[PDB]
Amino acid sequence: PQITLWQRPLVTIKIGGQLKEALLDTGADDTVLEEMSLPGRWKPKMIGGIGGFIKVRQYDQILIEICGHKAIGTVLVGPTPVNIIGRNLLTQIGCTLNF
Amino acid sequence: PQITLWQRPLVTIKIGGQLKEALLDTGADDTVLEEMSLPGRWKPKMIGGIGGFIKVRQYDQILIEICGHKAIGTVLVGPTPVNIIGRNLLTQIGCTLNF
Ligand SMILES: COC(=O)N[C@H](C(=O)NN(Cc1ccc(-c2cccnc2)cc1)C[C@@](O)(Cc1ccccc1)C(=O)N[C@H]1c2ccccc2C[C@H]1O)C(C)(C)C
Incomplete structure (x- = not known):
């Protein structure tokens, strides 16, 4: 689909059989994703944003559906303000910016 | 143009008579923008990202050019780690997400 940006590009995702709202974030x-349970072992990671860094749990090869598009990749879990879908998965679903 | 997300979507912008590199951020x-001088009146604002909030100066009705596309809007100036072009200006250049 083609999504305009007059409002936050929030979409429905499916992970672990549950539906959640997430932000398509090219930046x-x-x-x-916000605290949740995921299978397997996790590795440590520090991610930095506008107000500094936060520690998150890194799970690899996780199945996740975004707007019906299936992807399998790395999903981080931690104290994020909102669920964020980053470039690692936006590339998997063939997303691009256009103007 | 069509911008892929294999790498961070960085583009050149022109503002206040200065050429800078910025990130097209749908999130x-x-x-x-990082610390810089802008004309006119400003108001303080707190914006939050991953990591928390930072204090910035808010300047309204600021002219900016992104990839040759002119636009006008509010620009915040403060201790951000990178220059970020948000939805308030992405809409003006007709930027959309497609997949
Ligand atoms: C509305 O607030 C905003 O729009 N905030 C914006 C914001 O921070 N946007 N978002 C997500 C994001 C989305 C929502 C919220 C949020 C916070 C509180 C209440 N509601 C929503 C926080 C962060 C994140 C931004 O792309 C902005 C950014 C880009 C580059 C460098 C530093 C920061 C970002 O944080 N990117 C980082 C990120 C995110 C997830 C996983 C890894 C990484 C690494 C970075 O790529 C802001 C401050 C530029 C204008």
Whole structure:
């Protein structure tokens, strides 16, 4: 689809059989979701944003659907203000910016 | 143009008679630039990202050019780690997300 930016580009995603609202974020290198449970082992990661860095849990090869488009990649979990879908997954679903 | 997301979507912008590199960020409500001088009146504002909030100066009705596309809007100035072009200006140049 083609999404304009007059409002936040919030879309429905599906992870672990549950639906969640997430922000399509071209300015985010990674994908970070609010506290939740994910399978397997996780690795440590520090991600930096406008107000500084936060520690998150990194899970790899996680199945996640974005607007119906299936992807399998790295998902970070931590104290983020909102669920963010970053470039690692935006590239998987074939997303681009156009003007 | 069509911008891929394999790398951060960085573009050149022209503002206040200065050429700067900025990030096209669909996950940003506002446009915030690193410390610089701008004309006119300003008001203080607190904006939050991952990591928390930072204090910035808000300047309204500021002319900016992005990839040759002219626009006018509010520009925030403060301690941001990178120059960010938010939705308030992305809409003006007709930028959309497509997949
Ligand atoms: C509305 O607030 C905003 O729009 N905030 C904007 C904002 O911070 N936007 N977003 C997500 C984001 C989205 C929502 C909220 C948020 C906070 C409180 C209440 N409601 C929403 C915070 C962060 C994140 C931004 O792309 C902005 C940014 C870009 C480059 C450098 C530093 C920061 C970002 O944080 N990118 C980083 C990120 C995000 C997730 C995983 C990894 C990484 C690494 C970075 O790529 C702002 C401050 C520029 C204008």
